[PDB]
């Protein structure tokens, strides 16, 4: 079902005019610029703000090759969304990258019917993950892995001059008393070449 959703997003994007894509991206950049220029983030584990990015109800998908996950991203972190894929944390930057952006994406550390971010503990610094949105695919390299208590969101705010994405889930596995944050930093990337990115192959 999720992979069906991803295929739907992909096909749909191909049918969109490039000038149309670009206008919508500009809306997202502007949105992010307001966040960067400015709070009230709330832990999802106890919407239309991103409409410009939405295609087939999704704002894109996140790929994490080390653990072979490819999961659709939905705007907002309502439990309804977290039951079917990754949620984007409202109040954080939209996941299209850029100077002074920090997008936060979250998923359950396992559900009875879906692995989701179950194996996120196996990602190590230097591993890479990727976000495909309406404008193409961007890459991040993990630079920081952190465990925090549920009431600390300071790590989730924008860092001026920088381009980050944090993958947020609960930990330890089957306990979920804390939050695991796997953060990446933007790196240059162009898809569909002979490039191989695994840390094993690298560098």
Numbering used by the authors: 42 to 79, 86 to 93, 102 to 258
What did the original publication write about this model?
The pilin subunits of GBS are assembled into high molecular weight polymers via a transpeptidation reaction catalyzed by specific pilin-associated class C sortases, through a common mechanism involving specific motifs present in the pilin proteins. The pilin-related sortases, which are integral membrane cysteine transpeptidases, cleave the LPXTG-like motif of the pilin proteins and, via the Thr residue, covalently join the C-terminus of one pilin subunit to a Lys side chain (ε amino group) on the next subunit. In this work, we present the high-resolution crystal structures of SrtC2 and SrtC1 from GBS PI-1.
The crystal structures of GBS SrtC1 and SrtC2 from PI-1 were determined at 1.87-Å and 1.8-Å resolution, respectively. The refined model of GBS SrtC1 includes residues 42–263 for chain A and 43–246 for chain B. The refined model of SrtC2 includes residues 56–236; the first N-terminal residues 41–55, and the C-terminal residues 237–256, were not visible in the electron density maps. Although SrtC1 crystallized as a dimer in the asymmetric unit, the dimer interface is only 615 Å2, suggesting it is not physiologically relevant. Analytical size-exclusion chromatography under near physiological conditions (pH 7.5, 75 mM NaCl) indicated that both enzymes are monomeric in solution, even at high (0.5–1 mM) concentration. GBS SrtC1 shows an identical arrangement of the catalytic pocket except for the Thr rotamer and the replacement of Phe86 with Tyr92. The lid residues 39–44 and 53–60 of SrtC1, and 89–95 of SrtC2, could not be modeled due to a lack of electron density, while the conserved residues of the DPX motif were well ordered in both structures. Unlike SrtA, GBS sortase C enzymes contain an additional N-terminal extension, composed of one (SrtC2) or two (SrtC1) α helices and a lid that blocks access of substrates to the active site. For both GBS SrtC1 and SrtC2 structures, the lid overlapped the LPAT peptide that is covalently bound to the catalytic Cys in the catalytic pocket of S. aureus SrtA. In particular, the conserved motif DPY or DPF in the SrtC lids overlap with the LPAT peptide, with the proline in a similar position in both the lid and the peptide. These observations suggest that the conserved residues in the lid that interact with the active site of GBS sortases are pseudo-substrates, insofar as they mimic the binding of the LPXTG motif in the catalytic site. However, SrtC1 showed the highest Vmax value for BP mimicking peptide (4.44×10−2 µM s−1) while SrtC2 for the AP1 peptide (2.60×10−2 µM s−1).
